Design a binder for this molecule. Structure first.
Ligand SMILES: C[C@H]1O[C@H](O[C@H]2[C@H](O)[C@@H](O)[C@@H](O[C@H]3[C@H](O)[C@@H](O)[C@@H](O)O[C@@H]3CO)O[C@@H]2CO)[C@H](O)[C@@H](O)[C@@H]1N[C@H]1C=C(CO)[C@@H](O)[C@H](O)[C@H]1O
Ligand SMILES: *[C@@H]1O[C@H](CO)[C@@H](O[C@@H]2O[C@H](CO)[C@@H](O[C@@H]3O[C@H](CO)[C@@H](O)[C@H](O)[C@@H]3O)[C@H](O)[C@H]2NC(C)=O)[C@H](O)[C@H]1NC(C)=O
Ligand SMILES: *[C@@H]1O[C@H](CO)[C@@H](O[C@@H]2O[C@H](CO)[C@@H](O[C@@H]3O[C@H](CO)[C@@H](O)[C@H](O)[C@@H]3O)[C@H](O)[C@H]2NC(C)=O)[C@H](O)[C@H]1NC(C)=O
Ligand SMILES: *[C@@H]1O[C@H](CO[C@@H]2O[C@@H](C)[C@@H](O)[C@@H](O)[C@@H]2O)[C@@H](O[C@@H]2O[C@H](CO)[C@@H](O)[C@H](O)[C@H]2NC(C)=O)[C@H](O)[C@H]1NC(C)=O
Ligand SMILES: *[C@@H]1O[C@H](CO[C@@H]2O[C@@H](C)[C@@H](O)[C@@H](O)[C@@H]2O)[C@@H](O[C@@H]2O[C@H](CO)[C@@H](O)[C@H](O)[C@H]2NC(C)=O)[C@H](O)[C@H]1NC(C)=O
Ligand SMILES: *[C@@H]1O[C@H](CO)[C@@H](O[C@@H]2O[C@H](CO)[C@@H](O)[C@H](O)[C@H]2NC(C)=O)[C@H](O)[C@H]1NC(C)=O
Ligand SMILES: [Cl-]
Ligand SMILES: [Cl-]
Ligand SMILES: [Cl-]
Length: 845
């Protein structure tokens, strides 16, 4: 009866240390491990729920679940309702609820399915098979179902040892199944392994032998532990709500991601300028110093689209104010930035100063009047500590607070026309535990199961769990705080400006990408953290938050010149690129380094800017099709199992492989190359030539001034001329990099719109062009042409993989004025005068 293999034992004492006698009293098995793995575990016969009265409807299945014997947790809900909805051929959805009481739910908006579902009667379980190969994807029969008021546990076998997701944590892309506990409870803590961080995404993608995959999303916003076992298997442990589970069938990993984003929302489309270089630090104390940054960057030929300010601008570190010493002419500074073709961003915190005299600080006075703040047991606002001192916290689930936030934003924008919002401390972060007045002693503050959060209490670094919000207690809504503020800030920026919003958030939840982007927080200026940013940037793209990046050159401590060169090189490939720096630290602006470092840094930014039309096109695909912008090799080559554990290289879209140096003092790097031809992007003119891979590791030369970037054969990349801003670069002539397959084939595309407007796709206010190389010709296909795509000038076409030197080169039937061929690199470089919107034909022989 207790003969269960070590790796398949499920913890029967997740709540406390237990003795043999007690464990056996719980009706469990006690077998110490030989060397983590639970000593107290469930026998196959342990009491669970029983499936009764299973019935079928047009929507799917319905049943009753009954538990006869109570568990060791208080408040078992002995009678449950099961609902299974077969929503599409790719998406299966099931819920387990208490049919007698509404419980907290998260607010969110051959012809056969790829899955099949079956049920185990006793103990109850849900089994999900991939139809095509009969593989078992989900099997909840492996462990008992727990459904207590403050404890939900649902377990499943996993199809392999390869699983990714469950943000936000500092870890390899592929998670460890060796008795790993992964805690989701938003928390202000500098990124360090094994710790719950700023965001929580209860979703995972599981790979299957052969390259197929599936995803599971548990729509639950409560504090939770996700436990992984080497069998392999997984256990969801939540402290509240209900079980609301979606299964996505793929079969391709990209389709799994797309299918999940169908439920939580496709990434919002950023403004083009948002994809340029952002520069910030805590410590730009005055508008004179802030203007110097732009001056010094500009002087040194370093592009910069957006200048930022941290707390410096505010009056005594309060939102929606600016001080009259260093920032007396803040409005004029921001107006000047605009005149020059640049944008402006600044930090906003959620917490509002509550200690000023009545009537002296409108945001608080108005907020108090309209009841926008989270309240305590006695109904008064909860007061904690953040930068300005005593603070009240807005409740972004309260419609009136949404309206107040819109007003405060609009009013401040009337004074200083900022172009977006950097929203920080929105876990929400608290400098003291719970509140100035502590927290009461109840079941929400002291629950029967506390997940493995840093600090051992839900109140740590945040507000009281039993505090009141409009939709529910903070206990249920905490993981949504950041998200709700992001939603509120999204709408606020739309009303204030009338163009696409640009919101960068620290705290996030699943579905965050529909409204905002993210940066990874207070990472150290270390090689370790530079390396760790690659898996985390990829993780967030898999979770539908493509607009993500880490502070370039690091936030904490002092960076080194070498590290900042390497970080800027890799950083230029973060979909969101910002260099940010702490108050105490040494300057790390591109212009504050030696000339060789500056050159290396200038080259990185130049290449990013040249690549912007492609990057933007990738974001379009993310916005319209649930694609990822930055992706791991396995998403693109799932059937090559050697890619599965690669997370220190990244792809932009399908065709651009970036292989960064991530360690000090290296002049080479070893990267995995999937089967195919990979052309070195350094052969393309910007204002070994080819790696032929069977699917193998390749050692590449990579001196300090170099980052390896390769372009996949069979792909065409749109590029554009240089500029210190996107306002400037968007007016330049464009180019194509054409990477030919051995058979002389290639495909690519360009999306172009005004770059700022709302409802572009809905109104059809965009131009979409496809490029095709075939049989020594290059043509375009006009999928859509509008006024926005007008005047787009194509002046250069670079063809890679041209074996023999051509005797003639024609553009629309006429020999081109001049071209060059290099027999050493196989590169054909052609000068033309064409329009992306006009049908053209270029040929050679
Ligand atoms: C700026 C940053 O300050 C706060 O975090 C700091 C902690 O309060 C300090 O105690 C210290 O944390 C150390 C840990 O205690 C230690 O155990 C180890 O982990 O090393 C840590 C690093 O020294 O330093 C922390 C960072 O300086 C605050 O909690 C955090 O949220 C603040 N960061 C945000 C605030 C601003 C200012 O508006 C922005 O500049 C940042 O981008 C934000 O992320
Ligand atoms: C879903 O998970 C459950 C639990 O892991 C699996 O059911 C279990 O299957 C095992 C092995 O197939 C069963 O053990 C065997 O029982 C038979 C029947 O008496 C016996 O002839 C063998 O000697 C062996 O002991 C076990 O009874 C069964 N347990 C339960 C609770 O059902 C099931 O296989 C999984 N489903 C799928 C599709 O993988
Ligand atoms: C709910 O939140 C409110 C704040 O909105 C809390 O009110 C606070 O209550 C404490 C004492 O219960 C007050 O402390 C007192 O301060 C005065 C001086 O101002 C001092 O003379 C007293 O001896 C005492 O230290 C505190 O001032 C007050 N906060 C504010 C902003 O007025 C209330 O306690 C919270 N309720 C619960 C149950 O936590
Ligand atoms: C499982 O269902 C049976 C039958 O339920 C009835 O038929 C259903 C389709 C629906 O119309 C229900 O409203 C009906 O009650 C349950 O057995 C019945 O229990 C009721 C209430 O105690 C009792 O009045 C009847 O005599 C029973 N009828 C029969 C045929 O046995 C049973 O209780 C359900 N089990 C669970 C665990 O919910
Ligand atoms: C980050 O560096 C600052 C400054 O470092 C000093 O100045 C540099 C130009 C360089 O020459 C360094 O070697 C210097 O130490 C550090 O702040 C200094 O801290 C030291 C010792 O703790 C103190 O005696 C100095 O007065 C400080 N100088 C200034 C200008 O503030 C800071 O501690 C470093 N941080 C880390 C995490 O290493
Ligand atoms: C912008 O660049 C200027 C020019 O290098 C910097 O000005 C120098 O600052 C140092 C302090 O480290 C002084 O010792 C020099 O006298 C300054 N030179 C001049 C010509 O002013 C300035 O600090 C830079 N500003 C920023 C914000 O990076
Ligand atoms: Cl013992
Ligand atoms: Cl509720
Ligand atoms: Cl290998």
């Amino acid at each position: 009866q207790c003969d269960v293999p070590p790796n398949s034992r499920f913890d029967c004492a997740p709540d406390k240390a237990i003795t043999q006698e007690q464990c056996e009293a719980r009706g469990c098995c006690y077998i110490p491990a030989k060397q983590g793995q639970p000593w107290c575990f469930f026998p196959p016969s342990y009491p669970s729920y029983k499936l009764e009265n299973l019935s079928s409807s047009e929507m799917g299945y319905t049943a009753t679940l009954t538990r006869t014997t109570p568990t060791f947790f208080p408040k078992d809900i002995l009678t449950l309702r099961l609902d299974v909805m077969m929503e599409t051929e790719n998406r299966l959805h099931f819920t387990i609820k208490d049919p007698a009481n509404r419980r907290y739910e998260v607010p969110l908006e051959a012809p056969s399915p790829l899955y099949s579902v079956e049920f185990s009667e006793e103990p109850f379980g849900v089994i999900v098979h991939r139809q095509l190969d009969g593989r078992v994807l989900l099997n909840t029969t492996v462990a008992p179902l727990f459904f207590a008021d403050q404890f939900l546990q649902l377990s499943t076998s996993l199809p392999s040892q390869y699983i990714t997701g469950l943000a936000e944590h500092l870890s390899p892309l592929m998670l460890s199944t060796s008795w790993t506990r992964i805690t989701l409870w938003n928390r202000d803590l500098a990124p360090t392994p094994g710790a719950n961080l700023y965001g929580s995404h209860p979703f995972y993608l599981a790979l299957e032998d052969g390259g197929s995959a599936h995803g599971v999303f548990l729509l639950n916003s409560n504090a939770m532990d996700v436990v992984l076992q080497p069998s392999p298997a997984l256990s969801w442990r939540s402290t509240g709500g209900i079980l609301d589970v979606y299964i996505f069938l793929g079969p391709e990993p990209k389709s799994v991601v797309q299918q999940y984003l169908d439920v939580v929302g496709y990434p919002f489309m950023p403004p083009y300028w948002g994809l340029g270089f952002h520069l910030c630090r805590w410590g730009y104390s005055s508008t004179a110093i802030t203007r110097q940054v732009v001056e010094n960057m500009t002087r040194a030929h370093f592009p910069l689209d957006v200048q930022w300010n941290d707390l410096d601008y505010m009056d005594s570190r309060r939102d929606f104010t600016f001080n009259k010493d260093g920032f007396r002419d803040f409005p004029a500074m921001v107006q000047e930035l605009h005149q020059g073709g640049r944008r402006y961003m600044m930090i906003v915190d959620p917490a509002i100063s509550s200690s000023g005299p009545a009537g002296s600080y409108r945001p608080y006075d108005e907020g108090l009047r309209r009841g926008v703040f989270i309240t305590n047991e006695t109904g008064q606002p909860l007061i904690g500590k953040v930068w300005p001192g005593s603070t009240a916290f807005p409740d972004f689930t309260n419609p009136t607070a949404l309206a107040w936030w819109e007003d405060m934003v609009a009013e401040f924008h009337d004074q200083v026309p900022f172009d977006g919002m950097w929203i920080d401390m929105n876990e929400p972060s608290n400098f003291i535990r719970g509140s100035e007045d502590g927290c009461p002693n109840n079941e929400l503050e002291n629950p029967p199961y506390v997940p493995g959060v840093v600090g051992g209490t839900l109140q740590a670094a945040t507000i009281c769990a039993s505090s009141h919000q409009f939709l529910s207690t903070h206990y249920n809504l905490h993981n949504l705080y950041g998200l709700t503020e992001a939603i509120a800030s999204h709408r606020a920026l739309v009303k204030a400006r009338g163009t696409r919003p640009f919101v960068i958030s620290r705290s996030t939840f699943a579905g965050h990408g529909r409204y905002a982007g993210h940066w990874t927080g207070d990472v150290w200026s270390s090689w370790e953290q530079l390396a760790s940013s690659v898996p985390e940037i990829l993780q967030f793209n898999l979770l539908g938050v493509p607009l993500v990046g880490a502070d370039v050159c690091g936030f904490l401590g002092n960076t080194s010149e070498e590290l900042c060169v390497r970080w800027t090189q890799l950083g230029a490939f973060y979909p969101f690129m910002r260099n940010h720096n702490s108050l105490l630290s040494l300057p790390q602006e591109p212009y504050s380094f030696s000339e060789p470092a500056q050159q290396a840094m200038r080259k990185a930014l130049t290449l990013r800017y040249a690549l912007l039309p492609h990057l933007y096109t990738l974001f379009h695909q993310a916005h319209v099709a649930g694609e990822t912008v930055a992706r791991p090799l396995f998403l693109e080559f799932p059937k090559d199992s050697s890619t599965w554990t690669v997370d220190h290289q990244l792809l932009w879209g399908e065709a651009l492989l970036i292989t960064p140096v991530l360690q000090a003092g290296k002049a080479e790097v070893t990267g995995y190359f999937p089967l195919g031809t990979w052309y070195d992007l350094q052969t393309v003119p910007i204002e070994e030539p080819a790696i032929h891979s069977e699917g193998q590791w390749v050692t590449l030369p990579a001196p300090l001034d170099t980052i390896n970037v390769h372009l996949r054969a069979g792909y065409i990349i749109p590029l554009q001329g240089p500029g210190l801003t996107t306002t400037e670069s968007r007016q330049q002539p464009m180019a194509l990099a054409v990477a030919l397959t051995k058979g002389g084939e290639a495909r690519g595309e360009l999306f172009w719109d005004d770059g700022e407007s709302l409802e572009v796709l809905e109104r059809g206010a965009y131009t979409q062009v496809i490029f095709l190389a075939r049989n020594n010709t290059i043509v375009n296909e006009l999928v859509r042409v509008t006024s926005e795509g007008a005047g787009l000038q194509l002046q250069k076409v670079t063809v890679l993989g041209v074996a023999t030197a051509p005797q003639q080169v024609l553009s629309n039937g006429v020999p081109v004025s001049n071209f060059t061929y290099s027999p050493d690199t196989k590169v054909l470089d052609i000068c033309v005068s064409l329009l992306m919107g006009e049908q053209f034909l270029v040929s050679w022989c």
